[PDB]
Amino acid sequence: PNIKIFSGSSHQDLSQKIADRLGLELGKVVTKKFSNQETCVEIGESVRGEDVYIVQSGCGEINDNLMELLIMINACKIASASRVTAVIPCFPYARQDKKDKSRAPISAKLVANMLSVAGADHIITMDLHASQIQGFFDIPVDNLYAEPAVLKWIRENISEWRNCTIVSPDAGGAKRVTSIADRLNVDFALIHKERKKANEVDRMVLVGDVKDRVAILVDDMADTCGTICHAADKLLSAGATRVYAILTHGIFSGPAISRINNACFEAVVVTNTIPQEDKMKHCSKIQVIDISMILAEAIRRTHNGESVSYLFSHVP
Amino acid sequence: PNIKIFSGSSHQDLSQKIADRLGLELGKVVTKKFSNQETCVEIGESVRGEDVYIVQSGCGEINDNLMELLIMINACKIASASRVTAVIPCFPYARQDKKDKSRAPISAKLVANMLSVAGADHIITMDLHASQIQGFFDIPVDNLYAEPAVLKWIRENISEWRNCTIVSPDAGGAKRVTSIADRLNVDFALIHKERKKANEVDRMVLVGDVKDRVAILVDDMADTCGTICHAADKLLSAGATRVYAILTHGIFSGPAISRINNACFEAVVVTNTIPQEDKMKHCSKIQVIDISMILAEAIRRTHNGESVSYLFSHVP
Amino acid sequence: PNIKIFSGSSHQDLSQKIADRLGLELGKVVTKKFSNQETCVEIGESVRGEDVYIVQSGCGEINDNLMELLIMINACKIASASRVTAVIPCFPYARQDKKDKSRAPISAKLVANMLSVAGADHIITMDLHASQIQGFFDIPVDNLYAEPAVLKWIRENISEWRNCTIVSPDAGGAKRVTSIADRLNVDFALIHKERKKANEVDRMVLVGDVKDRVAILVDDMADTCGTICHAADKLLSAGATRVYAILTHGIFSGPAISRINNACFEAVVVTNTIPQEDKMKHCSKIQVIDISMILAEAIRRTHNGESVSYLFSHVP
Amino acid sequence: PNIKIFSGSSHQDLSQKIADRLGLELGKVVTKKFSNQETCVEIGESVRGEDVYIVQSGCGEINDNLMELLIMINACKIASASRVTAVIPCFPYARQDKKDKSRAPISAKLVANMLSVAGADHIITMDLHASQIQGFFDIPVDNLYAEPAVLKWIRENISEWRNCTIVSPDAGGAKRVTSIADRLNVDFALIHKERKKANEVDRMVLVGDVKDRVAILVDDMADTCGTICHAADKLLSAGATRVYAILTHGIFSGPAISRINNACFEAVVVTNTIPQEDKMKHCSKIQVIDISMILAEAIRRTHNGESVSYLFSHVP
Amino acid sequence: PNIKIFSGSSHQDLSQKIADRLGLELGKVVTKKFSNQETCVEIGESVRGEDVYIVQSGCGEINDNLMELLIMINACKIASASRVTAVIPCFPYARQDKKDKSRAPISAKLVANMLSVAGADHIITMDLHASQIQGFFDIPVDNLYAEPAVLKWIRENISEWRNCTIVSPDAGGAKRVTSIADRLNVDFALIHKERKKANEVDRMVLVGDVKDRVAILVDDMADTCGTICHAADKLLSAGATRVYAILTHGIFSGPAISRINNACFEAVVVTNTIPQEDKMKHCSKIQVIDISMILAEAIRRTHNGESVSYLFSHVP
Amino acid sequence: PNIKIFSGSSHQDLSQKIADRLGLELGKVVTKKFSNQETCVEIGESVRGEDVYIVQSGCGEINDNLMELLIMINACKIASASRVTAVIPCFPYARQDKKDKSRAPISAKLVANMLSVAGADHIITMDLHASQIQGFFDIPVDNLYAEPAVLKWIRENISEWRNCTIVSPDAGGAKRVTSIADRLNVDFALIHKERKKANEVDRMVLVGDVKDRVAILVDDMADTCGTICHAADKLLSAGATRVYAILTHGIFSGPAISRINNACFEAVVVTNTIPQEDKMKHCSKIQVIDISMILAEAIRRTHNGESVSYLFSHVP
Numbered sequence A, B, C, D, E, F: 001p002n003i004k005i006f007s008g009s010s011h012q013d014l015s016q017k018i019a020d021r022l023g024l025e026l027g028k029v030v031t032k033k034f035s036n037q038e039t040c041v042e043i044g045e046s047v048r049g050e051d052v053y054i055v056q057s058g059c060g061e062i063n064d065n066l067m068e069l070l071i072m073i074n075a076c077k078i079a080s081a082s083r084v085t086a087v088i089p090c091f092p093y094a095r096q097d098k099k100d101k102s103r104a105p106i107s108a109k110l111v112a113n114m115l116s117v118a119g120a121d122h123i124i125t126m127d128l129h130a131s132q133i134q135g136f137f138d139i140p141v142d143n144l145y146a147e148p149a150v151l152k153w154i155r156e157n158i159s160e161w162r163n164c165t166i167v168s169p170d171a172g173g174a175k176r177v178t179s180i181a182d183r184l185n186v187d188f189a190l191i192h193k194e195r196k197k198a199n200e201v202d203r204m205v206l207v208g209d210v211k212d213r214v215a216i217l218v219d220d221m222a223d224t225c226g227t228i229c230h231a232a233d234k235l236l237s238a239g240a241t242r243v244y245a246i247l248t249h250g251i252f253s254g255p256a257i258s259r260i261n262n263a264c265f266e267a268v269v270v271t272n273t274i275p276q277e278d279k280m281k282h283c284s285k286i287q288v289i290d291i292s293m294i295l296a297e298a299i300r301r302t303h304n305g306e307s308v309s310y311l312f313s314h315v316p
């Protein structure tokens, strides 16, 4: 079997980068819409007995892209592909990973079931919002970390990183922030927005010392940037000299760009798990860490039957 | 168990009509989008041990609506509903019902599998593009016909219906047209657009006599109205006095409204399996047959454990 | 893995032809009946890690043959075959492909589920009564066409084929007839037997012109030959000079042979998806198109991981 | 839900007896064959929300009957039956319950899987050839014993039953014979036909004393009656005064009737799990124990949610 | 259907309390071991059409208890129970909820799959180590909180609770601690043990102010009490006046009792999701919050088809 | 793919013998217990695309070992092993192979389902208590016989084996004993313990002649040795000169060692499907037949795609 890399409509630049790093051309696929807005998928080459990797991030037109991915997976399976792997850099519906409300769906589990029934044999993803999403499948799920790339960026772009403090913008980010602070041998802090019992002012509590130090906000994603912007205001109010925000998934939906442009961030750093070209044109603060080499190495090692553990300590 | 009727965002007027005919209020659901365009479903009441019917047509934002339906089905199932029925008046991806091309997906089968894995126990639909889609599920699938309502409309709105000829706009509609012509005891004709071997003019062949008679075009759906418009030009060129078009699913996507407005149709008749309010505002030729009574009777009989065979001979 | 071709009891001559065209000997199998008429299957060689193809048509003792096929598939799967493919030239129960009656089974879907649970990984079949039967499986299903062979036979055996008209014996055959007429660039006609509302005479309506022309009846199968015989009487009554019947599946059950012998057919042409040796001995009108080369090429390309699209335009 | 009893073509007299004992009329079903010998099933009444019991023994046209049963189960399931129970008095393919040969199918497991995929929720059967067949399903399987009826017949029809010896015709029947001998407080013996290493004479070894005593052969079934006839010759050669044969399943296929008529049996006693009317007309030695009351009580208790343990100690 | 409460061997006192609060006697079950240490389960009464709740905590002989629970679930399912619910107060293998190591199993997902294949229709559990474990099933999973009972205990047993600080013993407990601190309107702190890069001294970092205040350690479980004991030493070293530890699952395996007896805890508070009678006899610091009323109310509401949302704000 | 042999904690000496006979080192696995007695499995090497064989007998801590095996299977599957085979020399819960009691679980079927859901693709086992357990899986199950090794031991260790009688200790062993007696061309006898109707003395009935002959007791297993010890007393009381006991599974749980030491056995012969080192230290009568060569040959032939039928006639 040979590696066949197919791109959905979501992140075709990332698919191209992965294919170039693998020394391959992208597989021939026409991914369009019928007139009635139904997804049209036209695989333009044989995938018989091939090791098919479909790159599709959960971003942009989320349901459009997920349906595109499912249809492409099913087409490859029925076309007798040896193995179909869904490379989903940003897993859609990952934040709907539990039922903590009455009648609430576990949409991440539904997406996992849909991918399984479409015929996916393997999932490659980066920085799942909850790592337990790996357990939502009965197939192997690669949950790659952007943490080595984040550490590289911090050590190369922040002069006073050895005296910095890594800040969690919410309680759920504590593990990620503590891991990064341990790897950098720096202090960490946590910011919590307390629960909205009524319609008074949202107030943020900070635990840890950030006074007269550079604060690096690290989180898994910035959708509306309410979390990171509120954390940034709190950090400046607490005496932080400079505030950075580093995310792996830059969704930047809704008012995020205006929020960041009016915030105090020295830089907002995201990976290219989601296309950022449009976002960077309206926000100069955004910088992008390319993770295409990580995904390409993961695909290559999956095809060659080699461990991907190397990707959790080094940036290829 | 009690009937609980929930509406998706696709066709809420039809859901309201069904609920009124059942003497019920629509179940409390908030069906919106998160900022990143992920589907948000908030069922506002208990469905424990209830007989849940979710009305969602395949129309408008097709993938949005289908994801909404799947999430609502899964939420109801996890919320311990006694039974979850998907009332899908127009089945999405129904035209992708076979693999007659290399690497082509069977998207209808994928949609059926997704509905099954979401937890649907029963499907109620009207005039499946292919009746074999019933076989795409392992659960009961009600394939209701709009034919009795179509016959009622023909007998009440076309004065010379006894001398009319029912015309199939393509080869695939032949069974539907022959059934309608048999029930009306009238002649039938078939129109075929021959295959596009090269880039010459599309030419249509008509088998049957339509000269100096009213021609009624009957088809399962009109998406772009290319089929019915081309058939209408052919019918007028063949000597038909007046041309009607009767569909059960009025999709009217893309250039359909301009096509119909510039066509020669006496009337374009569709059911309300898809919302038509916007379409009727731009095309006076469109008239709507309400099928909400058929769907309401089907839901009521399903809940009461009664046969729906009555719906195939009478309009309630 | 190597190709292993196993024959059921249904069509062993076709299995032999396929094996010869593949340059193989048929796999050693004893397919008999126990005393109590239970199916006895004794695979006489190892199939470990082999690519097993089991040839069994739906014909003769239908349930006997289907049980034989299921038992052989399961034996091969438990015997650790790399892949088990059911080569079913005529799919049994294919006409029971929908539920258009109260309490009616979808027997084609049940057969598909039984084949899936027996362990079939791939289905190769010719001219499914409904192409949507491909969607009854979650495994790849090859629906081969006899149309290229039919076109070859028409062009080589009917002198006036360029002025002929291809006739559908019922409404459901319209797509097949229009496709053949397009490929031959000839006229087409359709014959419909209207629905039996009471016990009066069955009357047939013909749409299209067949007067003073050769009429070729093309259908997917002739079980009792009531359809083709009634169509032939109608065609002669309408002024057709000569009438041919071309089918892909010659079932010829019940009164079919006497019907054909007393009909006006110039020739009844079927493929050898079903054994015809016995039928030809009692009806001189029957001629057979060998499709063993099509099936052998399909099996060879499936084993070699090559596209079978070539089989839809050429007869090997 | 109400009890609905449907009969297949196999044993309709037993179905009638069960229905009469339940105070019900048999459900309206037409079970015939299409012209091409495909099974035709036409359920003539609604089974919506009903507790459906389908009676079909594995006998006669075995594959015909099993396909009939599967199609009826699937039709009832798709017709929205509350529960579908397969009442299979003699389980087909029960003797193919293991793989003790290379490439041998486990046909009993395949039949169980087919019944499960057809939609059976419950199996009621009598005296499975191997009780472990209960484990071939994931649904409850009632394995009823004919042993209480056998003990009743022995105590009422054999005057010297207290001095009799119960004889196993093979090694596999030892548990059944020991259980019966324990319940009767009588001696037991075992007869073994040693393995056919070459083409010499089949010789039978008897362990236990049967001299000058009545010998009762007890086995689960008599298909060809080779086992019981050879055992009877051995028992007479060993000095048994009279020889009885008691089976629960009288298959009597092939040469069984001539074998019994030429044997020395005082009586051959079978239950009516298989129709015996034809067999009794050609063999006066055959007597029938009616087990319809056992099956009717099992169905009634299953419907009422009551234990069937009473059936293992008493004959209702 | 009626509530049937069955106890495994793990926590029979809790099962008795639940049954008393439900006004029921525990179902008759013998749960012992065969001589070869295989689990023996003997359900002593009919569960036909019953709503069966099996109480079995993941504690003590973990694999013994889990196998007991699976066997009891399967026995109830095969015994035709209407519904089988596994009441698992402490979910076993819950800490193995992700694959963050090479070749690491997701044991929680395996346990969920085993419960699903045993036939569980519903899971009721308290304070899952990861709430995403709800997504490991395709059945409803009730993840009850001990938080209302914890808040009640804090407000009734700690005089200076309004000036206390709730402390997370690790980064993963941050959400639980922030929720509790929000509900009490008190400060919170977090303690992190940094990663063991080499064999130097384990050092703990504290973020937040605990000086001269009562510190309440809140975590989901205390297995070896290394986390809470190390956190307690850190809290005293940081100037906390008194230190409490509140857990929902008191596992107290290995050296936990000696660790607590030599620690500085004012009280170690656990629920009775795990039996604590033996632990309290050797550690006077341990106090138990009874949660049997929460579980009993959850079971009663599940049986009655009522929401359990009331249990997340009130202690019944 | 390469053979990877992994050992559980149950029988590591047998795993070592298998690995040596295969010329391999055992795969690196740490199989321990967490503090709370949860199974900890740490596979120490890549199994990507490997043919993994996990050796784990059902013995010792039965539930501990079975959970270990399931966790290791699941870890190998998620670690992308090409194929995972469970080598289970003594199948746990094999005696719970049917439901012959009210509410009784079929624990063997549950174990099979658990192995299937863990991801096992193949099962290799020796002398299943019921061969129908092969039918409890949908994957191939190798049921190897210790009979050739038993025959070798008899012919090499019992001087008067040609005049011996092979004795079944119960009715269920009759097939095994008759097969062995046929292969040795010797007499056979059967011993039955009649059912315990009340609390009187257990009495044993012997059918067959053992007077003044060596008696060889052959059974599939000796758990408590009650069966073989009672049979030995009966055989001596019946005039047997010497009594041997040959089992394939020596469980020897509970009072078995004291029972054997106080019995009259010339030798108790078992295979090493279960570790016997501890048992032999307290009972000199126990001798061990090594079957590691049989298991190693089975694994090697499974990997090489060769028949294992040779293992049923010869000891490698």
Ligand SMILES: Nc1ncnc2c1ncn2[C@@H]1O[C@H](COP(=O)(O)OP(=O)(O)O)[C@@H](O)[C@H]1O
Binding pocket: A141, A142, A143, A144, A306, A307, A308, A309, A310, A312, E099, E100, E101, E102, E103, E104, F046, F047, F048, F078, F079, F080
């Ligand atoms: N150091 C690590 N940190 C986090 N996750 C890891 C780590 N090592 C492995 N994983 C997880 O395990 C998966 C597979 O691990 P890998 O080392 O590539 O080999 P294997 O597939 O045999 O376990 C990765 O995709 C990742 O999800």
Ligand SMILES: Nc1ncnc2c1ncn2[C@@H]1O[C@H](COP(=O)(O)OP(=O)(O)O)[C@@H](O)[C@H]1O
Binding pocket: A046, A047, A048, A078, A079, A080, B099, B100, B101, B102, B103, B104, C141, C142, C143, C144, C306, C307, C308, C309, C310, C312
């Ligand atoms: N021209 C065609 N007309 C009809 N069916 C086709 C055609 N081409 C392909 N198919 C269908 O697609 C199946 C597989 O197509 P093929 O071209 O062999 O490659 P792939 O399996 O990769 O799709 C065929 O078995 C057939 O059912």
Ligand SMILES: Nc1ncnc2c1ncn2[C@@H]1O[C@H](COP(=O)(O)OP(=O)(O)O)[C@@H](O)[C@H]1O
Binding pocket: D141, D142, D143, D144, D306, D307, D308, D309, D310, D312, E046, E047, E048, E078, E079, E080, F099, F100, F101, F102, F103, F104
């Ligand atoms: N005494 C018995 N001997 C043999 N099988 C039995 C016996 N009692 C029960 N069974 C088996 O258990 C099944 C169901 O048992 P039953 O006592 O009716 O209640 P439950 O279904 O709750 O177990 C029966 O159909 C039969 O297969």
Ligand SMILES: Nc1ncnc2c1ncn2[C@@H]1O[C@H](COP(=O)(O)OP(=O)(O)O)[C@@H](O)[C@H]1O
Binding pocket: A099, A100, A101, A102, A103, A104, B046, B047, B048, B078, B079, B080, E141, E142, E143, E144, E306, E307, E308, E309, E310, E312
């Ligand atoms: N306030 C809440 N906090 C956390 N989990 C909740 C809450 N409300 C509901 N849940 C979760 O949802 C499950 C079921 O919710 P409930 O309100 O009882 O009704 P429904 O089952 O219809 O959703 C609970 O068992 C719990 O896991």
Ligand SMILES: Nc1ncnc2c1ncn2[C@@H]1O[C@H](COP(=O)(O)OP(=O)(O)O)[C@@H](O)[C@H]1O
Binding pocket: C046, C047, C048, C078, C079, C080, D099, D100, D101, D102, D103, D104, F141, F142, F143, F144, F306, F307, F308, F309, F310, F312
């Ligand atoms: N002589 C035999 N006696 C008993 N069981 C056998 C015998 N031959 C084969 N089997 C069973 O069949 C299984 C596989 O058989 P084998 O001959 O190795 O080839 P195949 O897997 O192709 O059937 C064995 O593992 C065993 O369970």
Ligand SMILES: O=P(O)(O)OC[C@H]1O[C@H](O)[C@H](O)[C@@H]1O
Binding pocket: F095, F169, F170, F172, F219, F220, F221, F222, F223, F224, F225, F226, F227, F228
């Ligand atoms: O401990 P024991 O019961 O004596 O030995 C196990 C026996 O139980 C079962 O019948 C096995 O076939 C053996 O004969």
Ligand SMILES: [Mg+2]
Binding pocket: A170, A172, A173
């Ligand atoms: Mg967060």
Ligand SMILES: [Mg+2]
Binding pocket: B170, B172, B173
């Ligand atoms: Mg059409």
Ligand SMILES: [Mg+2]
Binding pocket: E170, E172, E173
């Ligand atoms: Mg923790």
